[PDB]
Amino acid sequence: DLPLDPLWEFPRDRLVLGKPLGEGFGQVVRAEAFGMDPARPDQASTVAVKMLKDNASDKDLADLVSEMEVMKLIGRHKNIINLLGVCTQEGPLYVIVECAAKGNLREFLRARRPPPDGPRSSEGPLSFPVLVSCAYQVARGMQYLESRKCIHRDLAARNVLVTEDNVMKIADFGLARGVHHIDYYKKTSNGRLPVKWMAPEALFDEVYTHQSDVWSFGILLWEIFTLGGSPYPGIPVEELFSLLREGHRMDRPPHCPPELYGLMRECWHAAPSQRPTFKQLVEALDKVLLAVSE
Numbered sequence: 001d002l003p004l005d006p007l008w009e010f011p012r013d014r015l016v017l018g019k020p021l022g023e024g025f026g027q028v029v030r031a032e033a034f035g036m037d038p039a040r041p042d043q044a045s046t047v048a049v050k051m052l053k054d055n056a057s058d059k060d061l062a063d064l065v066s067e068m069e070v071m072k073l074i075g076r077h078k079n080i081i082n083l084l085g086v087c088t089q090e091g092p093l094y095v096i097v098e099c100a101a102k103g104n105l106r107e108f109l110r111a112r113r114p115p116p117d118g119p120r121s122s123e124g125p126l127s128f129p130v131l132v133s134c135a136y137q138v139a140r141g142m143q144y145l146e147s148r149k150c151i152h153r154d155l156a157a158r159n160v161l162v163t164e165d166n167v168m169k170i171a172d173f174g175l176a177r178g179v180h181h182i183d184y185y186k187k188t189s190n191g192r193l194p195v196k197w198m199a200p201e202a203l204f205d206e207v208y209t210h211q212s213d214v215w216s217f218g219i220l221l222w223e224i225f226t227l228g229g230s231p232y233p234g235i236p237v238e239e240l241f242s243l244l245r246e247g248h249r250m251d252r253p254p255h256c257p258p259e260l261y262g263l264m265r266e267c268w269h270a271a272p273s274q275r276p277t278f279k280q281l282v283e284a285l286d287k288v289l290l291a292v293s294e
């Protein structure tokens with residue numbers, strides 16, 4: 001029996017749930033909405049519905065409620081997943097957000113790795129200026145979130161969604177992260193080791209700043225230009241600990257210009273103050289994007 005928010009309340013009967021998309025902090029199901037635009041009541045639209053699992057411990061609810069409230073106040077930005085509406089009255093809690101039809105950035109890239117009929121046999125779906133654009137968009141989305149004082153605490157390609165128009169949208173930015181209980185050896189459902197995105201001050205000192213998201217952004221950069229690779233590939237977690245303590249970093253990935261590996265290394269500077277800010281990252285990536293001629 002949650003309170004009614006008229007601005008965000010959407011009739012649940014105007015939703016038609018489809019196939020589930022993924023899990024977590026609750027689950028997410030693809031659905032069709034009717035009249036999401038109040039000007040066109042009978043117009044369908046494909047949205048993503050966030051709801052509780054069948055676990056329903058009351059802190060799962062509180063966490064989803066908490067995420068909902070964050071979604072309400074973050075505001076609108078093209079490079080983050082935006083709230084469309086919520087269903088709270090007379091039924092299960094739904095959090096309706098934008099749907100990115102091409103999945104997350106990692107799945108997007110791995111499915112588009114280069115391959116002999118035709119004039120462009122060698123040409124894969126992914127070009128350098130499009131990879132830079134992906135990075136630049138995530139940077140500006142993160143720049144926005146930082147300005148609204150929203151730390152991500154888990155920034156990865158897995159948490160960056162790709163729309164039909166190849167627009168990068170940052171997801172799951174307003175979340176309870178379980179910061180004080182992280183199983184550093186625990187890999188997720190899709191085999192991800194979140195510890196490999198953690199800044200040293202976050203990993204060793206449990207300290208999160210916007211600069212700790214910058215470290216993660218550098219890891220996200222490595223993912224992009226490996227076309228969906230897993231960072232510290234094949235390296236056991238036990239090694240990652242002593243590896244970072246000795247100040248070691250990932251090598252420069254194949255077919256990656258020194259401009260971008262330089263940016264990566266900058267984001268991975270030990271001291272938070274000697275890392276670029278997202279604003280500086282946006283500008284630097286823009287200059288690269290500018291250098292693409294025509």
Ligand SMILES: *C(=O)c1nc2c(C(=O)Nc3cc(O[C@H](C)c4c(Cl)cncc4Cl)c(C#N)cn3)cn(CCN3CCOCC3)c2cc1Br
Binds near residue numbers: 097
């Ligand atoms: C609807 O536009 C639509 N969405 C998807 C997605 C998809 O991932 N949508 C999506 C997922 C979201 O969060 C989940 C939990 C999620 C997943 Cl499933 C994966 N990685 C990260 C996260 Cl956060 C959110 C949110 N918030 C919003 N939208 C995936 N697909 C399938 C892509 N399709 C597969 C077959 O080849 C072509 C591409 C879709 C499809 C659609 Br229509």
